[PDB]
Design a protein around this ligand. Sequence first.
Ligand SMILES: Nc1ncnc2c1ncn2[C@@H]1O[C@H](COP(=O)(O)OP(=O)(O)O)[C@@H](O)[C@H]1O
Length: 390
Amino acid sequence: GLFKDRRVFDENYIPPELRVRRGEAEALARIYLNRLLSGAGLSDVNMIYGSIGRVGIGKTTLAKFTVKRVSEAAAKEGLTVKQAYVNAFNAPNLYTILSLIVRQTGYPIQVRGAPALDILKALVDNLYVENHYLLVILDEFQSMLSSPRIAAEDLYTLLRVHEEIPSRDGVNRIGFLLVASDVRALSYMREKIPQVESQIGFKLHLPAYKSRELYTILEQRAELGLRDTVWEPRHLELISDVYGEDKGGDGSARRAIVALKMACEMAEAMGRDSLSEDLVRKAVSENTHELEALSIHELIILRLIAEATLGGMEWINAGLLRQRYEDASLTMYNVKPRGYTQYHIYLKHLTSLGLVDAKPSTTLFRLAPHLPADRLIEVVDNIIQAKMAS
Ligand SMILES: Nc1ncnc2c1ncn2[C@@H]1O[C@H](COP(=O)(O)OP(=O)(O)O)[C@@H](O)[C@H]1O
């Protein structure tokens, strides 16, 4: 045993307090509560997303922890807010979303063989009967927007419940916290459900963790879940210094905690009394996303788009980007520039990706608004160099 409590390291564990997102949780929780306390109970739809390609940055955690503190602060006011969490990777339709929600309520709502609409009505009625409020988390919400097994009208009936399913006493008792992978979710939403999107109370973008933030996160897991003589700060700094986004990493707290976990269980198999720097570096060592799968040609092409975007141009034409890609491809990346239809297939792939936007009337292209060019280019150049040398 290096562990004093192994649960602290499970993927699902939230700590009893936040030390990095900690302010921006008690606060939000303050938002959610003020609407409750001012009357007009629970109805807002809020949203959390990150940058594109970023994972393990505290989205889920911030949401779960925010809902929990809303519950607690509400309880002190004698109110009663219930929590539901639903992951879209587990919920292919409206039926299955509602069924997960009601099972977490504990209410006696008939769910077997029942219409979705009927479940939602029973839920609205139980919340009135109980005088309870429900705050629902919809995680991986982007993959609900694209799912063809969920229609616009389903998202509407859920997310504007109160417009379609009035309360016995007029009090709205369901709010939602959407968690999406990135800002592309908002376009989709304006496409599919603009009547909800134009009405979102708070949209919060979360940045990837810096090294000092990863330190603070690891330290707290160490304090809570490892024996006190087992780690020193130096051991934690070896992970945070590599994964901190200010030092060229991901900013992933999941990669950071997993690494620390792994090193602890390597020490244990050795019967060792503590961590050693070696074990941590070993873990860090055996431990960009939808950019990481692209072809050098797509990377090379997308890079040049960001440079136009970086130096004046809003919208490049096809012919121009074409010769530029040709010029750079053979002369600068020693790869042989592909043919015309193949180039335009790359260009279709990056637009289907929301990494590039098109403008029809060959087609006009600019870097997707949400990507910073100078720093994407910096990223696109590490991934571009992992492919040059193979
Ligand atoms: N602010 C934080 N404080 C403590 N732990 C965190 C924090 N943010 C993230 N974590 C941890 O890092 C891992 C990844 O977090 P998660 O919320 O799943 O990121 P995302 O949803 O953006 O992929 C989880 O173990 C989570 O507990």
